[PDB]
Structure formats: structure tokens, C-alpha cells
Design a protein around this ligand. Structure first.
Ligand code: SF4
Ligand SMILES: [Cl-]
Ligand SMILES: [Cl-]
Length: 238
């Protein structure tokens, strides 16, 4: 019909929103994920979803102690993976084992191997980024949020993953309307943002911390918001 940034243009202060988020919540940027193989990083992202970061890090250590090669996890099948995930305290062990095992046995049957290293070889052009996006999207169970996370964290490609916490804040800011689902919010940010890996990385990290730590689902901390003078929603909460 018409690109989403046309139907809802960004505000004048949008650059100041980026600079307050960065200065407040991530003045020092964490490093990118440099795992041996992008497949490790995708598994790492799955572990962290609907999880505490404390258990997610524990499951990663235990999963890779248990399966030094991802080939070992494939041979163990979803039941052994589930046992391994559950042994580290996870709460979604059956679902995630079927998910992870489905990605592995998919790679093996259709690529003869369990490696995503070919994702690194696509050109760093607009087309090549879209090639890597498409390749991640062909994997069974991997949705747009997880595609963007792996592009941003594991491949240094300028995707624009937006976390649920960040989306909730953007809507309270009325940067984007309530009608829009997560995939549209992601597309809008990818249109309004400079296509620079670092700046998008800085936004994702800073935007999550703000939405998680300041703009909480219940009882947001509007008076400590650096974005307070900009947010229409501050008056409702305060
Ligand atoms: S002003 Fe309040 S509701 Fe608006 S983004 Fe900041 S914390 Fe969230
Ligand atoms: Cl790996
Ligand atoms: Cl789990």
C-alpha cells in the first residue's frame, strides 16, 4: 500500500531520543556475539527467550559442556537435549528441545552439515543482508524477531531487532501506533534508522534496558525517563 514510515513519520526529536537512550542506558556498548559459528548464536538466542538471563547463561554453559560439537546434540535427539536443558533449571525444556533439534536436523538433511558460517559470506550490500535474512527465515520455527537478533548480534549486519520492552515504550511514546504488531514496529524502525550496524546495535541494547528498567509494563518510571519531556503517556501514569 505505502511504506510504514510514510503512514507514520518519526518525530522531530527522534535523534534526541536515540542520544538520550544511548547516553543513559548504554554509554558503553557490550561486544557483539563472536561465537565460533552463527548456529551457536542462534541457539544462544533461543535459550535466552522467555528465560531469566541467569538460567539462560547456565543452560548455555551446560548445553555446550554436554555437546562440544553441535553434531553431538543432533545424534542425542530432542529427548536428550530436553534432559540437558531441564538439568540446568529451564522451564520450557520440551518445547525448546524440539525447536533446537528441528533446526539441527534441518541443517543436516538440507545442507549436509550443522553450520551457519555461509551466512557470513553474503555481500554486505542491501541485497546480501536480505539474503542472510531470507536464509535465517527458512529455518523451522525461527520468527522475525529471532532473525533480526542473529543478524544484529552474530553477523554484524544492520538489522533492527526491537524487543517487547522497547516496543511497549515506543507505543507509549506514540512513535508508532497501537495497531501495529511486532513485525511492523520492526519494519518502521528499519526504515527510520540509519543503516549503520553500530547505531542499530546501540539502539537495540539501549532500548531494551530503558523499556525493561524504566518503562516497566506495570508502573513505568516516567519521572526518571530521559524521554519524559517527549512522551504523551507520562501524564497518564504520573
Ligand atoms: S514516559 Fe513513561 S510511558 Fe513514556 S516511554 Fe517513558 S517510561 Fe514509558
Ligand atoms: Cl558455535
Ligand atoms: Cl528451557
Amino acid at each position: 500500500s505505502r511504506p510504514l514510515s510514510e503512514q507514520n513519520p518519526p518525530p522531530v526529536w527522534f535523534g534526541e531520543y536515540l542520544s538520550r537512550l544511548r547516553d543513559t542506558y548504554a554509554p558503553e556498548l557490550p561486544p557483539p556475539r563472536q561465537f565460533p559459528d552463527p548456529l551457536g548464536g542462534l541457539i544462544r538466542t533461543i535459550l535466552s527467550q522467555q528465560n531469566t538471563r541467569r538460567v539462560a547463561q547456565r543452560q548455555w554453559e551446560v548445553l555446550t559442556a554436554t555437546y562440544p560439537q553441535w553434531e553431538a546434540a543432533l545424534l542425542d535427539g530432542p529427548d536428550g537435549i530436553e534432559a540437558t536443558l531441564k538439568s540446568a533449571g529451564g522451564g520450557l525444556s520440551r518445547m525448546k528441545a524440539d525447536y533446537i533439534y528441528g533446526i539441527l536436523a534441518h541443517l543436516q538433511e538440507h545442507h549436509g552439515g550443522l553450520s551457519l558460517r555461509f551466512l557470513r559470506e553474503f555481500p554486505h550490500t542491501p541485497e546480501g543482508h536480505e539474503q542472510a535474512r531470507q536464509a535465517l527465515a527458512a529455518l523451522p520455527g525461527v520468527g522475525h524477531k529471532t532473525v533480526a537478533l542473529v543478524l544484529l548480534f552474530d553477523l554484524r549486519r544492520p538489522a533492527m531487532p526491537v524487543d517487547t520492552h522497547m516496543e511497549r515504550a515506543a507505543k507509549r511514546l506514540e512513535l508508532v501506533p497501537a495497531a501495529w504488531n511486532s513485525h511492523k514496529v520492526e519494519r518502521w524502525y528499519a526504515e527510520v534508522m540509519p543503516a549503520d550496524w553500530e547505531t542499530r546495535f546501540a539502539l537495540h541494547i539501549s532500548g531494551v534496558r530503558h523499556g525493561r528498567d524504566t518503562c516497566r509494563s506495570k508502573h513505568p518510571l516516567c519521572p526518571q525517563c530521559p524521554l519524559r519531556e517527549f512522551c504523551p503517556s507520562a501524564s497518564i501514569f504520573e
